[PDB]
Amino acid sequence: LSNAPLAASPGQADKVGAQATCAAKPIFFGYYRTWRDKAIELGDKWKDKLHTKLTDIPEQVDMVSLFHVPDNQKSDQRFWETFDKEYHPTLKERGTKVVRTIGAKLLLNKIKEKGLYGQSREDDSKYREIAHEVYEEYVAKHNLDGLDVAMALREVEKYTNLRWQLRKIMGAFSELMGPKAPGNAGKKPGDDGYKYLIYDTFDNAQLAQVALVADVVDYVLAQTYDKGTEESITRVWNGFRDKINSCQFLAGYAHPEENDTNRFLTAIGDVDTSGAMNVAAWKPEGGEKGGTFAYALDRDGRTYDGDDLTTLKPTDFAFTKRAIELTKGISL
């Protein structure tokens, strides 16, 4: 309805650099593969043997993101029924936030379908329309806590019009979520009823294009899946420190998946000495970070050796618990 212009301002948050204090304590963030849940209905060679449920993740997890891919299963109705009936009440009792991840390519395709290019002036209503549609479908439909835009496309950094589209759609989202939303007036990340706006992207700030969204997001999730050393995470944060503040930064790691070909070796082996726990324990020099995130919680402790590359197995969430203990400094 609104016709106000979506500005292209910012380039950096209201506060940047390492912040020794913020209102919200560090959190542990978790990416959850929905097509590996026991409630999802997947010719799949693993039509059974689905052991892990969404409630299986430790209770100390602060926020979990549903990474839903429609092309990976046949039907999701049973999964949504189990989420509404069983998963979500348990996670609400635990106090674990639930957010939904959406790919940036989908947002770009929705922008293109609306006829929008990338310009300064461009019909102030279509971006809000796409944002509200995504908000209704992905967040409000299941009363989630926010939306996580996953932008790992290098073409956005290369092309001006794609950057314009991303900035405008993220501003439209910021009218609904994040600190810029009026719905979050007098609220802070962690408070009941707060709507989060999350941005996950590369660990390279230039390719990440974080300067487009730095002023409208609550957290920036840096996919540091090949790091696992405090020096590299410090270098990444220093690459990010001039566009965002430290309390928005979360470096992460990915657990080895079945048939992945990517090969991330930071979260393999002994937990107490793994690079993933270096990331979990790392902190911005003279500052507090936003927390730690991990991809594929159902693959916690898996490797790329032996049957791990071709077999699904339950997990004890050892890496998850250790990362929680290193992030919040408490004992489980």
Binding site: A8, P10, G11, G118, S120, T160, R163, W164, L166, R167, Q209, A211, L212, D242
Partner: protein, 204 residues
């Protein structure tokens, strides 16, 4: 969209306290009939507000080309501080940023050597050579003089990277008359020289 170019001060300006060194930020291709440009200047990440803009050049062909000039302190530039220019305009999704600084590395003193003309070159209708080698940071100044008066008919090659990481160059002063009477000085200015200045003589 528009493009941003950041140019450093001239070496002579940064080597003499009597001169005024300035870093230049140039915004080009501000086409669309909606201009205005906002400049922000930063020294080591700290915002400074002592720059001087205001030389807008239309340069027709459906673009504008705005410039901002920031006066820099000689010691600040020589110490390796970074200068950042941030350009903000409504036609960009995010402000464009550029950063320039003196080349990193330990300064090395230039060695200056004057060379007389080869004998074979005396039969054709001569060239006095000035080799400056072994200096760090390609910023340098080279001039020719004689009897306290500057010589104009000379040309200097750009700095060339040597095999040890330093730079070298040659300057050629074409000239007989004064040289025939046994009369020249090649002056070199670099950040590692005593008083940022040295002179080498060459005579018959």
């Amino acid at each position: 969209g528009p493009s941003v170019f950041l140019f450093p001060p001239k070496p002579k300006d940064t080597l003499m306290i009597s001169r005024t060194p300035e870093v230049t930020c140039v915004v080009v291709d501000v086409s669309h009939e909606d201009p205005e440009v906002k400049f922000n200047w930063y020294v080591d990440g700290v915002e400074v507000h002592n720059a001087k803009t205001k030389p807008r050049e239309e340069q027709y062909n459906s673009t504008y080309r705005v410039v901002s000039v920031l006066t820099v302190l000689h010691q600040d530039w020589l110490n390796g501080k970074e200068y950042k220019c941030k350009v903000s305009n409504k036609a960009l999704p995010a402000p464009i940023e550029k950063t320039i600084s003196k080349a990193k590395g330990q300064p090395r003193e230039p060695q200056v050597y004057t060379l007389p003309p080869s004998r074979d070159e005396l039969t054709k209708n001569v060239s006095l050579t000035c080799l400056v080698k072994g200096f760090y940071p390609s910023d340098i100044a080279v001039e020719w003089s004689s009897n306290g008066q500057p010589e104009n008919n000379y040309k200097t090659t750009p700095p060339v990277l040597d095999s040890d990481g330093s730079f070298f160059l040659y300057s050629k002063l074409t000239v007989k008359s004064r040289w025939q009477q046994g009369n020249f000085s090649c002056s070199v200015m670099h950040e590692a020289l005593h008083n940022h200045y040295t002179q080498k003589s060459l005579s018959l």
